[PDB]
Design a protein around this nucleic acid. Structure first.
Lengths: 204, 116, 110, 82, 128, 60, 140
RNA sequence: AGAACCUUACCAAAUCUUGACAUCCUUUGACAACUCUAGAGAUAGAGCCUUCCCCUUCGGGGGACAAAGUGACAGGUGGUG
RNA sequence: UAAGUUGGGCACUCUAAGUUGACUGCCGGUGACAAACCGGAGGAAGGUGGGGAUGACGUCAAAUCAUCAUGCCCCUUAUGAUUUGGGCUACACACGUGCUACAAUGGACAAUACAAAGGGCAGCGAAACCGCGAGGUCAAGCAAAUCCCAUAAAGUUGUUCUCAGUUCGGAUUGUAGUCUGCAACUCGACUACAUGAAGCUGGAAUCGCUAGUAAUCGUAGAUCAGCAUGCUACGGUGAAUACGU
């Protein structure tokens, strides 16, 4: 297509892969097992808005690291909920796991977090325009070299598929030394689907 | 890109253009007894004038450097003469067909030489 | 002609003469030159007493005078006599293995 | 092409064997797409299901150039004006 | 005696050209050139090194070459010969720069792009 | 439709070769890769996602 | 603009043989084309025994055109390189169109006849001359 | 980027209707391998065996289900770029 | 030593990761002195060396609800669905693509050479035996610079066909076999034999190619239990043409 998710080209040059394990011809089993944990992630997504997870496969152990929106209750008061998450994952993937929760970068300047935020804000019957203004305001307040959020679909309870963009600063896409964070989200209340792609440009 | 109307405009513009260039362009010291032929686009905004001069490769250049200045007078009088609505811009170019056609006659010698 | 079959080109090589009509054919050239020795000595008909000594015996088993004709005739007789599950597709130009005919030009068909 | 000798379905053969022990039967409902011509089907009749309705066709004595898998094209009129 | 070395890499063909004293000749893989390289009467180009470089004193050649086509292998000998002449003494380096055949040609077969076919022809246009 | 194909390819088969390697996350019948058991578009989607550690395009 | 010309030739005497081996190289095969042009070389040196250089030079000096055309038609002066290339192309076209028996009898007959300044080569030459001289009405 | 069956969305036939599949409640539970029979096959009847395997402080959970009832339902390659 | 199989080194090539390098970076001239332009030297790379991904704003109510999701309408004892046959591929046909020939630069026969890339654990089948061939059978090595798939074809070395519907040509069907599939008929491929139509470069129109290029001739991979005239990737021979808008 005209525009392709840039993090597809970015990976393998400056940034690591979403999922990582040892190389062998039995990649089908590893990928079909990883898909189960990826689909299971939604349970923690719906309450902690975890951006993404890097999963590692040791000699016989599995290491993951979630980027939660807040670590306080994902780690629990004193570890009241991590053990049951580990047990559920062990049951589902038919293999144990080594959960290492790390809080996402303190500033809410990342991509998937704000993407889910604005998706839920739209689903809660709030003006996408005002939400975008707040998002870009706090984005430039926090300090970012470039940030744009696109939306598409039937906005504002309409029947017309229109698209909007609200960017700021220098945002080099064709440039490769950009170190960006492409995200996506889906939102609706009663009307179809409304996709949003948030782009973050932090440092070169 | 050509219509009969453009042809009539070219003929009637040639007749007046030859007249003005040889009877009213005094100030350029290099006046030259010239022959002319003119073509235009279908919309009469562009016109090409083709002409011949007598002299060397510095006298044709002097005459051209004089025609370049005189273009204003030519356009003014030409618009003051003809009914045409939009004055076409005018550029003057040598009719290379004169020398090319002469060179075209040259190889005739070669055909007659080998057969004789 | 003289050697066998119906007619044989004169002053020609044997390899094309044996394949000018219904006969041994030229795809069996390697087999016939391995078994027999009568071949294209030169482009003209050099049939001598030494020639045709054993090539007729080597090709004898391939009785081709009307054998293919009778075989095909009985095959088409069975085709149009018995149920024509293949005969129905034999009018449209389809083989036993099928053709998926789309460019039905006027060669096999009316 | 050909493997395991002649190809059968091993259940139509049961029906034909059961109906051939007594006087031969001229009505046999079947599918007949995984069976081949072989001498045990002489004197019988089969209704091969071409796709709309199985139509009986009697077995003749010259089954060398015909197969019982198909008697008429499943493409009725063979998809053509003529 | 002393033996120089040169190499030629072009058209995915690498010739490990080794130069030895002698009458001036080659042994491609310990074999003669006339029958190894099919229809290769083009040895005029291969001996152009002797006719234009280092006066006309022919120098024996031993070449172990693998990869690429026979013509590419033949042109790969020229690069090795030229390199050996260079490393013999730098006096003719400039002349070889001015006599051609010294700048290695990086022109090899390029990639295949979608849109071509068995004949490397771009797709046609919607006519009629 | 395909809602019964997702189970038919998973249900019993009459003989040895009766199935096709369909996609797991997707239900796309055609254009599947037997190495990953995923369709043409699913492979592209996850490769753009960087899930597979394989290298990126434009390496030749 | 660049031509990527090739200097050397198995027969060093004439560099037009480079163009010969290039144009007769149809269907991506060089060996048999070079073989048949060597056969033409030998036969033209044999039939009416003379060095093929003189007969080839006569063919490439008598069949050279001076009148060509570049909905108007105009005679144009020809560059020598284009003139030689068109002459060699016409030679190979005559070789194709003659369709004689042997590999090179047609080729040798063509070169010899062109050296004689007769035959279909000069017929095409006078066709170019008279067709272009018919177009002189647009020169003025 | 694989049309003999499966493949395929259609027709015909054998056919069920919480349905082919899947989840939620319960009677509960390691999911039945193989044969004979009616049946074009499905499917069905059985012989046969699936058969707490993990924690079990004796349950229970889960964990699969053998069949069953239940309201949702599931489902649409039905439609709408 | 048949052969890099062996002892010896990484010398060369090649082999993967750091580093210089082509960046206008220098000179002469042109250019308003500047930018820039032309030529040159050095220089593999001279005016971004070549090739590939990265396709602005947007246009097409362009395509996809049939990857997936997806709001709404409908059937929901049928508009859902278990199993068997076909069917998307039929032909008075036309269409566009692709493959094969119209040829003696050729066909046919015999000895003979040059390539990289990719895949391989139950798969890749070393050698070999048998068979008319397809292929049947046994069998070596290898989780891979070891071993295999696998030979490169044209081409070099000699011969024949001698201008014909041709020793061009394989469309057409028939006979008997081979791999896989329980099954090769609508419905795989291949083989041995026979049969031998048109087509002798194609009218107006018409497409493709700017240098390792076209054109040509081969090779490998996926698609697969088996089935590629389609696709991708690799390799070999290898030209002129652009004066000029």
């Amino acid at each position: 297509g005209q525009k392709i998710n840039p993090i597809g080209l970015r990976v393998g040059i400056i940034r690591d892969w979403e999922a990582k394990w040892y190389a062998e011809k039995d990649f089908a089993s590893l990928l079909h097992e990883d898909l189960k944990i990826r689909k299971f992630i939604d349970n923690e997504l719906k309450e902690a808005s975890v951006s993404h997870v890097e999963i590692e496969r040791a000699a016989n152990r599995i290491n993951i690291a979630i980027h939660t929106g807040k670590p306080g209750m994902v780690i629990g008061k004193g570890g009241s909920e991590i053990e049951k998450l580990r047990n559920k994952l062990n049951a589902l993937t038919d293999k144990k796991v080594h959960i290492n929760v790390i809080e996402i970068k303190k500033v809410d300047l990342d991509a998937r977090l704000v993407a889910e935020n604005i998706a839920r804000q739209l689903e809660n019957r709030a003006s996408f325009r005002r939400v975008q203004k707040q998002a870009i305001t706090r984005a430039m307040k926090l300090g970012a070299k470039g940030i744009k959020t696109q939306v598409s679909g039937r906005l504002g309870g309409a029947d017309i598929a229109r698209a909007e963009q609200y960017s700021e600063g220098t945002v080099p896409l064709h440039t490769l030394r950009a170190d960006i964070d492409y995200a996506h989200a889906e939102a609706d209340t009663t009307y179809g689907k409304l996709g949003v792609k948030v782009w973050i440009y932090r440092g070169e | 890109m050509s219509s009969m109307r453009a042809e009539r405009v070219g003929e009637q513009m040639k007749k007046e253009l030859m007249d003005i260039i040889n009877n009213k362009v005094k100030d350029p010291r290099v006046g030259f007894i010239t022959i002319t032929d003119v073509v235009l686009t279908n919309d009469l905004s562009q016109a090409k004038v083709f002409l011949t001069v007598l002299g060397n490769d510095k006298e044709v250049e002097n005459t051209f450097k004089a025609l370049d200045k005189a273009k204003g007078f030519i356009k003014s009088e030409l618009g003051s003469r003809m009914r045409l609505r939009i004055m076409p811009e005018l550029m003057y170019e040598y009719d290379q067909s004169i020398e090319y056609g002469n060179k075209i006659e040259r190889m005739i010698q070669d055909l007659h030489k080998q057969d004789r | 002609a003289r050697i066998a079959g119906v007619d044989i080109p004169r002053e020609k090589r044997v390899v094309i003469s044996l394949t000018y009509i219904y006969g041994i054919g030229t795809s069996t050239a390697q087999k016939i030159l391995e078994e027999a020795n009568v071949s294209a000595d030169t482009r003209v008909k050099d049939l001598t007493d030494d020639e045709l000594g054993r090539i007729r015996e080597v090709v004898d088993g391939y009785k081709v005078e009307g054998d293919l004709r009778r075989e095909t005739n009985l095959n088409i007789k069975r085709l149009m006599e018995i149920s024509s599950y293949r005969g129905i597709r034999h009018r449209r130009g389809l083989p036993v293995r099928g053709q998926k005919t789309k460019n039905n030009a006027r060669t096999r068909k009316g | 092409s050909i493997k395991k000798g002649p190809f059968v379905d091993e259940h139509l053969m049961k029906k034909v064997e059961a109906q051939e022990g007594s006087e031969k039967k001229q009505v046999i409902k079947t599918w007949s797409r995984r069976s081949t011509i072989f001498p045990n089907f002489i004197g019988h009749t089969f209704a091969v299901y071409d796709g709309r309705k199985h139509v009986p066709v009697y077995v003749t004595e010259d089954m060398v150039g015909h197969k019982l898998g198909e008697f008429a094209p499943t493409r009725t009129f063979k998809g053509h004006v003529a | 005696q002393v033996e120089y070395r040169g190499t030629g890499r072009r058209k995915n063909s690498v010739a490990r050209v080794r130069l030895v004293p002698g009458e001036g000749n080659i042994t491609v893989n310990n074999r003669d050139v006339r029958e190894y390289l099919p229809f290769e009467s083009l040895i005029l180009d291969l001996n152009q090194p002797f006719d234009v470089t280092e006066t006309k004193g022919n120098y024996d050649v031993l070449v172990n070459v693998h990869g690429g086509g026979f013509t590419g292998q033949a042109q790969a000998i020229r690069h090795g010969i030229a390199r050996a002449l260079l490393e013999a003494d730098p006096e003719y380096r400039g002349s070889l720069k001015r006599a051609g055949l010294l700048t290695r040609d990086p022109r090899m077969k390029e990639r295949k792009k979608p849109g071509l076919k068995a004949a490397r022809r771009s797709p046609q246009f919607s006519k009629r | 439709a395909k809602t019964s194909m997702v189970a038919k390819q998973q249900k019993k088969q009459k003989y040895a070769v009766r199935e096709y390697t369909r996609c797991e996350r997707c239900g796309r019948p055609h254009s599947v890769y037997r190495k990953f058991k995923l369709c043409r578009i699913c492979f592209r989607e996850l490769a753009y996602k960087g899930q597979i550690p394989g290298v990126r395009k434009a390496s030749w | 603009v660049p031509k990527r010309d090739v200097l050397p030739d198995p027969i060093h005497n004439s560099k037009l043989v480079t163009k010969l081996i290039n144009k007769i190289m149809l269907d991506g095969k060089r060996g048999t084309a070079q073989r048949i042009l060597y056969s033409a070389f030998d036969l033209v040196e044999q039939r009416s025994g003379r060095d093929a250089l003189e007969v080839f030079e006569e063919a490439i000096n008598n069949i050279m055109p001076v009148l060509e055309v570049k909905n108007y038609q105009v005679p144009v002066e020809v560059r020598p390189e284009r003139r030689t290339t068109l002459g060699l192309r016409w030679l190979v076209n005559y070789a194709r169109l003659r369709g004689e028996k042997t590999m090179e009898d047609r080729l040798a007959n063509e070169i010899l006849d062109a050296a004689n300044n007769t035959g279909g080569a000069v017929k095409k030459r006078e066709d170019t001359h008279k067709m272009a001289e018919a177009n002189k009405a647009f020169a003025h």
